[PDB]
Amino acid sequence: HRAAPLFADQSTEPGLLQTGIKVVDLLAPYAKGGKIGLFGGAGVGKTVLIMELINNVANKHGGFSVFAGVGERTREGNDLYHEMMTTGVIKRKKLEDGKFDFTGSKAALVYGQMNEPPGARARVALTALSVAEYFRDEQGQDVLLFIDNIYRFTQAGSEVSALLGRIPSAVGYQPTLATDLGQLQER
Amino acid sequence: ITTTKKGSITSVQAVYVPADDLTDPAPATTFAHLDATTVLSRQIAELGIYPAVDPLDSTSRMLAPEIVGQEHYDTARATQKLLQDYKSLQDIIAILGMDELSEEDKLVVSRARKIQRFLSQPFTVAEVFTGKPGRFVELPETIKSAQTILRGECDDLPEMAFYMCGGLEEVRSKAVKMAQ
Amino acid sequence: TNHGRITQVIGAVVDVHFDEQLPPILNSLEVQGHTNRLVLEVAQHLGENTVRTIAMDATEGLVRGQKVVDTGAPIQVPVGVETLGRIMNVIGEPVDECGPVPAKKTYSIHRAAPLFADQSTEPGLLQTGIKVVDLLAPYAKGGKIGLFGGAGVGKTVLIMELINNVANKHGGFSVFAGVGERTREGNDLYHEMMTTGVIKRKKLEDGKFDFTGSKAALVYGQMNEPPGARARVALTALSVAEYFRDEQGQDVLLFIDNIYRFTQAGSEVSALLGRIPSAVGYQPTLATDLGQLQERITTTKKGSITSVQAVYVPADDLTDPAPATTFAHLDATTVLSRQIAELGIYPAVDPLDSTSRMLAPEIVGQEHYDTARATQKLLQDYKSLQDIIAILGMDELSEEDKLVVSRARKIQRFLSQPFTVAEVFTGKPGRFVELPETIKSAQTILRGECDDLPEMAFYMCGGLEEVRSKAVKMAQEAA
Amino acid sequence: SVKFMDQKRSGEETVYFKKEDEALLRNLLANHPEYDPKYS
Amino acid sequence: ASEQSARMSAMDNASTNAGEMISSLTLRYNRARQAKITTELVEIISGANAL
Amino acid sequence: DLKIVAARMKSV
Amino acid sequence: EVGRVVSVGDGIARLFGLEGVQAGELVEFQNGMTGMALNLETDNVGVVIFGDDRSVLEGDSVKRTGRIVDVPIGPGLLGRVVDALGNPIDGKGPIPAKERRRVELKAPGIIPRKSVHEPMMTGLKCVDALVPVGRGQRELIIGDRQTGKTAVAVDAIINQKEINDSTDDESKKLYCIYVAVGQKRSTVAQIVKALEQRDAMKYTTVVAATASEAAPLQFLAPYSGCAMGEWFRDSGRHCVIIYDDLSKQATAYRQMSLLLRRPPGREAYPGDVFYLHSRLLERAAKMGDKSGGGSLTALPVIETQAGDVSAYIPTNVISITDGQIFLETELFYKGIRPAINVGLSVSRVGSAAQVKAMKQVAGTMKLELAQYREVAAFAQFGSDLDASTRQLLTRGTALTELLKQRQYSPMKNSVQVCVLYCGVKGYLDPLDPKEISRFESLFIDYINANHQDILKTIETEKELSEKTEAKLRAAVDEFVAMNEFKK
Amino acid sequence: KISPSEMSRLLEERIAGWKTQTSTEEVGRVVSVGDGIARLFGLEGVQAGELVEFQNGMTGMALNLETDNVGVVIFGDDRSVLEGDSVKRTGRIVDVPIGPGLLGRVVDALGNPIDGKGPIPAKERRRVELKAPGIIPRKSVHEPMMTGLKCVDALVPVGRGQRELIIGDRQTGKTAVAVDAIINQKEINDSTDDESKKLYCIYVAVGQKRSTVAQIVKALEQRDAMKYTTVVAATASEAAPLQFLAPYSGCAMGEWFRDSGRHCVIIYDDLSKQATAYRQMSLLLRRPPGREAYPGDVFYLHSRLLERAAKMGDKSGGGSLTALPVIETQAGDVSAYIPTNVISITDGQIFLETELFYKGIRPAINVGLSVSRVGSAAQVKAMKQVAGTMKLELAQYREVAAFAQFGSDLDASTRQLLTRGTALTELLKQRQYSPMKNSVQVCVLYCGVKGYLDPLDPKEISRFESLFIDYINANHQDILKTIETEKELSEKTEAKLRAAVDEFVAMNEFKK
Ligand SMILES: Nc1ncnc2c1ncn2[C@@H]1O[C@H](COP(=O)(O)OP(=O)(O)OP(=O)(O)O)[C@@H](O)[C@H]1O
Ligand SMILES: Nc1ncnc2c1ncn2[C@@H]1O[C@H](COP(=O)(O)OP(=O)(O)OP(=O)(O)O)[C@@H](O)[C@H]1O
Ligand SMILES: Nc1ncnc2c1ncn2[C@@H]1O[C@H](COP(=O)(O)OP(=O)(O)O)[C@@H](O)[C@H]1O
Ligand SMILES: [Mg+2]
Ligand SMILES: [Mg+2]
Ligand SMILES: [Mg+2]
């Protein structure tokens, strides 16, 4: 739980993000400090797009990346971990004593499992967001944050508000919806 | 608010309807206390018709032939029948088109659009944002015009000649000027 | 007997204070000093030797501090052959104006269901004399049956026809429970039962009565009664039937009109008992309160209870929680429709929503199973062609589709039949169609033998031969 | 649209099959004389 | 031939108009769905807080 | 209501 | 005993004391105002006030009378307008009645009843023919706003003056009760004026619980009317009671229950609304020959919103009534007045509440109207049709134009029989539809001028023998000969 | 508003200086009872989820610990319990036995049998609410389950470690799909001595009535299926806590097979019933509700339940626990609360429809909405080779379906799609309690996709398949053994298959 950047410590000059993908950089150009919706499930090649974004932003922009799993399926997390270890995004090399040596990688992971209660699934995106704010502030390099799924974060907030006895809003959602989404997205 | 043996209060109340929902408790309760009703509509205002009165949801208790004459009552009921018959064809006109309709239905649609546009009056207070002068209209002129439009003595005229004209002499003059 | 004092009164909910020896839940309490008899059923324990109870009759005239007496047992209803030919209330009191019930025994309406070890019997087939029922939704002899429908579709008429066609021929006994129906219907049913020998009242010179024979028992909790009565009258009738099942061992027939009222009664008091409402106003204890009832209705190794429940479906919405929960408790289902009754097709059974566990090739042979499934396939095909007919017209349909439409219309008109009790609506006489005739006729219509016959002929005809006779008459009247 | 289509369908089917029933009633007794009471 | 050409054109226009009506009805359906959820939930809550 | 709009959507 | 007021607000009081109060009894304050005790809580008592709460002052003394809330009954009410509690508001004299009756009572059981066999002449044609009503029945009049419900009920009231004037046997007369809940006094005065203008008040009474009147009076007025009608029911005299609108009563009950801090349910109503209307409508009944043979017919009225009968109150009152008379605005503006939809409208009693002379015609009429409704949509589009189909359309249009009626212009049963005979046997097919509105009127005058004997015979024998059949046919032939129309 | 300590029997003790608080943390006094809930004063020391025992032998679960009282749900009726009774801790959290002693036995939600055959041996008693496995111990799904249905095994495959929801409307054939999945394992389990190639089965029932659980047991005993499965029955007469706990008891019983390395499949009937019971327990404890009165702990509930279904790695044993939860949708709207919560949790969807159940399409699987996020990875290559074609063919049929009523006016290249789609749809039909093996499925689908059924009348296909099966089962058992052993359809076996098909067609004669 960290306060967002102030009005003074904020850049007024917007700028694109050189990914290295043609359709993206042509018809849907991204931006620094932006928030990009990704409407697509499985059977479309989303995970490979994710790994490519990570690798290309690490090579060119020199910036690391973060992945947050907000109430994701556990087997999907295992699959993603193995795909990352395969594609070279993660470098898990065994050591002599029996430890591991995570050498130069390109992404941290923060998994909030579906089996976790509400309160954990609601406070996972903030964890990865702080992990990324570390690289932003002291390291001073651009970073990519992936959240899968934003709606699940909203569901966790609604549940947590229902447990504490707060009267729900229009469609059952909590009355602190836009405020919490802003506390997240303004960072 | 009620007329008594001492005096009388006529009342004209404007009743808001939130979210265009007439099933709201407030207007629903208020309907029971009224002697006359005038339900304005947004669908009719989007067509540029003003006053945007829905003549089917509007009603009154002083329409019976024991108060107004039988010519007034009959004209009003014929107009209501015509507009309901036009409303009943809105779906099939929107999906398929006017070509599917028969000739009786096409005549009905013509007269219904004409009488809709004819029930549109430019007021005096609207001159500030409309420009056209006001038109006071007596009752017998309205009844004669409705009778003529229903009989079929005005099918030759266009449809946009009834828009904001008051009586029929204005409609015929506007049709003349529009012939050019 | 203990003694208590009424503490407060809120509608049909009464709090009572005892100085000692609180009564268990479901126990019955009698108010002392009232005009008529007033029984209360314990529902909750609140604290401080206080309980919360539900009144069977109106609380008008009750006073705080008024005295209450515990009976040491729940509402005990009389049972035996003495209840036969006789009407009874929720508390066992008679309302037939013929004398008191001289029963030598009483059973508590609250009992525990038979366990899993007490298995059912074979799925015995039940012949009602109705065509669509015997064909597409065969009723089991030992299982629950449901009649789902809104208002004005023919539930009460169908139950009355089933009574005429089953209860009279039944060698065992029978029970009826009126749970929040109209009282006029009860009077009509009682008179019809006295007429057709199902009840045999014989007055005596000494002012008494004699209900010898009279293989039927009636229980009534009608709309005029408050909640607490409408809820428990079903348990009353079910205990009356459980007596004949367990001890006597005779097969029993139970008819319930409507079960939904029983669920509604609970909602009427739940918020007064301090419960939070459920989805659409119903109580939380809906599924459990209904299952505790339904599980008591089941065949065992001592007897069998064949039940027939009419389930009101408000606004023709089958997604409502009450019928939605009741669907899972039934062996056979029969859903009545308004769209069909508009066509004058009575009984207005929808053969695409009616189902039955019995319709399997091992229970009913393949001649029955394949016939039923072919009928259903034909009707679904006719239903899929409705939009093409409505937009384009019959001109666009091929001859195969026209044959399909003709056969489907003939089947629809053929499943109709006139009942004996509907004479006072149609004037036509009643029919009793056995099942082999139905199967023969359906096979004949589906095979294409009767394509020549006109569609109008298949109306209110018991058998195909009658259809031929009607077609002959219509052709002769044509010239 | 709903009641419109439903009633249109019902009327069209009713008319079509009324015509067909009129023809079948005309041509019945010839092709099925065993039912014809004239021969009974 | 002219009849068949006009038939194809009419079917095109009818399908387009049907798509438009479907869009409008979808909006109305979602609005009514949200309203139903809110109404039922407010009923439950008001019955829960009046205890 | 809902049933009305759903029925209309299905028909269309 | 006595008590003192502890809290006051919104026409409701919370008392401390009166430990010997009966739930539902009358209570008197020290300023003349009355109340009704409903919530007998432990510490306090919840009273609903019959008037304004400006009089009560949080400390006022309060006393119990011991009487359960009751109302007067008798023939002293006939011709009078009274409030929910029997207090008159006509402004002319008190109520001369000695015997009282409790408001909330137990309905009669299953044994002291019998089937419905006598009809209740409504005066209309579509009702008396296609949706018949009996004596002992409970038939709902459900519709939208401004569709002709109160008009139906008032025509039912007006049609009885001829039947009552031409007899002195109370067993055949039909008395009437009009309960006005939620209405404004102008409307009730208009109804009273319409009835007095036609001498239709010497056999009616009115129970006005208007909008300014507090919620408890609107909640109690229908039960007061049922109590006034139970006198006729148990004395062997038939009566018909009309409730306008019942939904207003439900709203008043919701208000009272919510201000007594009772928890709500669906649409903020309680769960006891079904019990409320069942309590009220099950008191209508047809008693046996041992209990006098009386009756109390009921004709409740309900206003739906947007024709939604899937709502909570309409669904209940539909499920606890013996019929329905639906009324639609589309039919009201198309020209059909009364706007009765004969498809949805039904009557479970049916022909048993119908005369044989009306059965003979109404069966054929119902069949023909079903066929016409079935092919009406197809006919509008315009396609070639067979002569039989065209004939069906012509007869259906004729009958639809026959069942129209003016307001406050009811008719006798024999005249309905004659008119529907003219309509069914084909004396209107070639005639122009728009002309029928005078074919009716003239024909009526003709058969009231020269053929009174046919009407007397139908009124007495209540059937159509072949002689009356032939006489009526000859009369119709003479009428068509003497007159000329557009076809 | 008064506290249990503030009642006027204890304050007479406190005011009198009585300090008889030696009443231990084990014993408490009932304070309130109603609707299957009890509220106690005492037991300061009881754990959440702990069992407690009353005077009259009944037992309950403590859920809502509070500062002044304790909320208990009862495993029975409230007529036994009354205010003033005593309650004592058992000390043990709710648990259930596990082992081979449950195979062929029907039990309630606490292991207590209801078959009437005898007690249950149990060397191991496992908790009911446990932590699910993590991420490292798990493994990717690479093995099928073989329901026995053609449509599922081909187009909506189910792997070992998967969670394939069976969602549908009332009376569509969900329980039938489950029971077919149970029955198809007979030939595979009886044809093996090792307990690692087998597949055990568990059938949890919730909200059902006994008169159909008994029918299920009867059907499985007819076919000798109960020897390798067990039933958990929490019926409608049984109280809400038991309906709520039965699925967790089943998962506990299956965790033994998972950890041991044995493969088991668990079926839940219906989960929605469980949600309803939980709602009934939360609204009576006066917990705060949500939409449709469901609490916020419903997603957590189904998630805790289903995330135990897993495929463990070779270091844990290689076991698995497949799941086939069943859900009833009331109008096909899968936008409701519980369906939307469950489809988000699951790795697939089997959507059964009612319009197809009456068109003869039984099982009524709508392959358009039915998916499997695992996919061909849960298929042998012999099935991939035909399924990759049939899926495309049925999609093409789905694009030209409305033209079936106008195909007389169209041309070729669009009637062929309709014909092939119709033939395949008539092929995928199946009979109740008559599943097939994967080899026979491959053979039949090879006959189908390769055009050997286009020129036939559709109504005769149901004959064709049957005869063909007997034909191959009479003549070319070697082909079936090869397909079952090698799990591949090579060109030589494909040529053998075409030869057998040609011989079969030559022997028999069909309509069109
Ligand atoms: N048979 C009829 N013929 C012509 N007009 C009629 C007829 N019946 C009723 N009306 C007219 O309908 C209008 C409404 O009258 P009515 O008093 O019956 O309203 P309502 O249906 O009771 O609804 P509400 O009282 O809530 O306004 C009146 O103008 C009346 O003249
Ligand atoms: N392949 C099939 N072939 C023929 N009939 C089938 C088939 N599958 C299911 N059925 C039949 O469909 C009906 C429903 O059976 P089933 O109980 O399995 O469905 P369900 O969805 O579980 O019903 P419920 O809602 O009561 O749980 C039964 O009559 C069954 O025999
Ligand atoms: N077999 C039938 N034949 C003719 N009319 C019927 C038939 N069944 C019902 N009806 C009509 O519908 C009405 C329904 O009344 P009822 O039998 O009590 O059904 P429900 O209780 O479901 O409303 C009947 O009064 C009758 O007018
Ligand atoms: Mg009924
Ligand atoms: Mg009115
Ligand atoms: Mg099932």
Side-chain angles (χ1 to χ4, degrees), chain C residues 8-9 64 182-184 261, chain G residues 18 41-42 282 319 322:
Chain C
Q8 47 177 107
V9 174
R64 284 172 296 165
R182 305 148 179 71
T183 306
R184 179 180 60 75
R261 283 295 182 236
Chain G
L18 321 166
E41 296 288 356
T42 315
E282 285 273 302
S319 78
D322 295 302

Side-chain angles (χ1 to χ4, degrees), chain C residues 187-314:
Chain C
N187 170 269
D188 302 0
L189 170 68
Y190 190 54
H191 278 309
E192 204 170 315
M193 283 165 113
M194 289 190 288
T195 287
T196 66
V198 186
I199 290 162
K200 285 183 171 59
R201 194 167 63 176
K202 183 173 184 165
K203 198 182 179 205
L204 308 179
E205 81 304 341
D206 61 333
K208 313 308 196 312
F209 279 82
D210 185 19
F211 301 95
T212 313
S214 70
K215 55 189 167 67
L218 282 86
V219 192
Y220 281 126
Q222 305 290 19
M223 299 173 180
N224 56 344
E225 304 300 316
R230 307 212 285 281
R232 310 288 171 231
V233 73
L235 309 169
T236 316
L238 187 39
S239 187
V240 169
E242 278 181 320
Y243 179 83
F244 299 131
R245 186 193 71 199
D246 303 315
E247 308 205 349
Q248 303 230 344
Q250 306 288 290
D251 318 323
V252 192
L253 291 163
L254 183 70
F255 303 92
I256 288 148
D257 211 53
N258 318 287
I259 186 65
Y260 164 73
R261 283 295 182 236
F262 156 95
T263 272
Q264 176 159 38
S267 69
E268 301 203 0
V269 295
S270 85
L272 288 170
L273 297 148
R275 301 175 195 164
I276 305 178
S278 192
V280 307
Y282 289 113
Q283 57 264 30
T285 75
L286 193 152
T288 42
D289 285 15
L290 185 43
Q292 293 281 359
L293 180 79
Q294 290 283 358
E295 296 292 342
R296 293 172 65 182
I297 299 154
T298 191
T299 308
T300 72
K301 287 144 180 169
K302 299 183 184 175
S304 85
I305 293 163
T306 305
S307 68
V308 191
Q309 296 140 45
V311 194
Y312 187 68
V313 164

Side-chain angles (χ1 to χ4, degrees), chain H residues 44 47 106 227 230 255 264 283 287 409 416 504 509:
Chain H
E44 303 102 327
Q47 314 184 25
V106 185
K227 58 180 181 203
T230 188
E255 277 179 8
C264 75
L283 297 167
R287 279 199 197 171
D409 306 353
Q416 185 63 19
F504 168 81
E509 318 91 312

